[PDB]
Write a protein that holds these residues in place. Structure first.
Motif, PDB file in Angstrom:
ATOM      1  N   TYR A   1      -1.099  -2.801   2.125  1.00  0.00           N
ATOM      2  CA  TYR A   1      -0.186  -1.954   1.351  1.00  0.00           C
ATOM      3  C   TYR A   1      -1.037  -0.953   0.575  1.00  0.00           C
ATOM      4  CZ  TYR A   1       3.977  -0.728  -1.350  1.00  0.00           C
ATOM      5  OH  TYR A   1       5.051  -0.068  -1.907  1.00  0.00           O
TER       6      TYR A   1
ATOM      7  N   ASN B   1       0.874  -8.024   2.406  1.00  0.00           N
ATOM      8  CA  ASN B   1       0.681  -8.701   3.687  1.00  0.00           C
ATOM      9  C   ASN B   1      -0.688  -9.373   3.682  1.00  0.00           C
ATOM     10  OD1 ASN B   1      -1.013  -6.462   4.079  1.00  0.00           O
ATOM     11  ND2 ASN B   1      -0.007  -5.787   5.971  1.00  0.00           N
TER      12      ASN B   1
ATOM     13  N   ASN C   1       4.045  -1.873   9.063  1.00  0.00           N
ATOM     14  CA  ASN C   1       3.377  -2.812   8.169  1.00  0.00           C
ATOM     15  C   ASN C   1       1.996  -2.358   7.722  1.00  0.00           C
ATOM     16  OD1 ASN C   1       4.986  -4.990  10.291  1.00  0.00           O
ATOM     17  ND2 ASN C   1       5.433  -4.889   8.078  1.00  0.00           N
TER      18      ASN C   1
ATOM     19  N   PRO D   1       3.428  -9.138   8.720  1.00  0.00           N
ATOM     20  CA  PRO D   1       4.247  -8.060   8.199  1.00  0.00           C
ATOM     21  C   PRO D   1       4.157  -7.984   6.680  1.00  0.00           C
ATOM     22  CG  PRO D   1       5.617  -9.650   9.399  1.00  0.00           C
ATOM     23  CD  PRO D   1       4.246 -10.246   9.277  1.00  0.00           C
ATOM     24  N   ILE D   2       4.560  -6.847   6.123  1.00  0.00           N
ATOM     25  CA  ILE D   2       4.667  -6.683   4.678  1.00  0.00           C
ATOM     26  C   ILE D   2       5.881  -7.481   4.216  1.00  0.00           C
ATOM     27  CG2 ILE D   2       5.314  -5.050   2.830  1.00  0.00           C
ATOM     28  CD1 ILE D   2       2.436  -4.617   3.657  1.00  0.00           C
TER      29      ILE D   2
END
Ligand SMILES: [Cu+2]
Length: 129
Positions: free
Chosen positions: A114, A47, A71, A85-86
Motif C-alpha cells: 500500500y 497486504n 492490490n 490482496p489488500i
C-alpha cells in the motif's frame, strides 16, 4: 498447525511479528493475514508481499502504480514470490506458496505495498533447516 503462521495488522504501520521462519520439512507454507482494525479507514489498507530483500524497493515503487484493483503489485512480477490482496479493518486473507520457491542462502523480506507503507511495514523471512 504444521506449515502455517498468522500475522496481524491494524490501524498502525506495524506487523504483529518482524520475523517468520519456514520449516524446511514443509512442502507448502501458508500465511494467514488479519486486519484487526474495526472499520475500513483511509490509508489503512494492508497486504503481505514476499520478495528477496534486494528487490523490495523496486517491487514496491513499481507496485504503487498498479492501483488498488491490482492490490498494489505489478501483475505477473517474477520478483514477487507470493502476496495477499489488500484488506481493510475486520477482514482476513491468506496466501499459500511452495517452499521449493525459496532458497537457504537467500535473504527475504515481507512488506506491505500500500503506497508508502513498505518503509516501516516489513519483516524478515528465513528458510530454516
Ligand atoms: Cu500497510
Amino acid at each position: 498447525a504444521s506449515c502455517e503462521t498468522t500475522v496481524t495488522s491494524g490501524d498502525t504501520m506495524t506487523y504483529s511479528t518482524r520475523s517468520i521462519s519456514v520449516p524446511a520439512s514443509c512442502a507448502e507454507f501458508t500465511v494467514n493475514f488479519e486486519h484487526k482494525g474495526h472499520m475500513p479507514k483511509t490509508g489503512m489498507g494492508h497486504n503481505w508481499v514476499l520478495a528477496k530483500s534486494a528487490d523490495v524497493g523496486d517491487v514496491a515503487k513499481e507496485g504503487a502504480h498498479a492501483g488498488a484493483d491490482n492490490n498494489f503489485v505489478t501483475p505477473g512480477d517474477k520478483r514477487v514470490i507470493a502476496f495477499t490482496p489488500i484488506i481493510g479493518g475486520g477482514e482476513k486473507t491468506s496466501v499459500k506458496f511452495k517452499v521449493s520457491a525459496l532458497s537457504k542462502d537467500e535473504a527475504y523480506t515481507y512488506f506491505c505495498s500500500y503506497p508508502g507503507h513498505f518503509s516501516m511495514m516489513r519483516g524478515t523471512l528465513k528458510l530454516e533447516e
